[PDB]
Amino acid sequence: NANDIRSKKVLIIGAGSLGSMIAENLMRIGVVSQGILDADLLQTGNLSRHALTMTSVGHNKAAALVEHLNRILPDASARSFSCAFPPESEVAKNSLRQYDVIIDCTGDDGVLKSLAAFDWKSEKIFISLAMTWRAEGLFAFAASETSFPVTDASSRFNASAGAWHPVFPARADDVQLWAAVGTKFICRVVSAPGRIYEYFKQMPDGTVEKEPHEYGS
């Protein structure tokens, strides 16, 4: 109950490829109280690796994603922030401070720094998810702190660092794979919060491995 993500207010910063698919996965499992933050417009070049369709081209990614999420469940309560992080409005900042789980899906080092400088005013569950260049791997970081630990996150990221092959550019199936793994990561972290870092890798034979190894041979 208190470790159930479905009862949590979840903020996703970044409504691009990975963030949009994770947000949809989380809504379908019942995470109805979502905030989506993104300043960018959806463009046609995004469509090959996104949750949304051509009907959202030219619309703010966060506003358009929220419209989609709110069509999934009768009690969906997604809200959009059509701005960069952090917002300038103090009313908007206080709205963001109401969320329990803060998920960075931007792959942007500037956002990590902004997360650490922002005053969250109470302890949060912070999660940072991003893929490698050709989506061969997934960086998964989580912390339960009052301030986001950008230095430790960066240290963990740096230490780990046909067209179906992982060594080819990232396609929709690659992003869906990591959105699925990332959604599971989010659920597991919120169920047992703490400082956690995992690095996932997809293999040419279709398998998926994790560092550190935990399950199986």
């Binding site: 970044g14 490829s17 991003a130 490698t132 990221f157 660092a161 990232a170």
Partner: peptide, 5 residues
């Protein structure tokens, strides 16, 4: 590190 999302 190059990260993408």
């Amino acid at each position: 590190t190059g990260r993408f999302a």
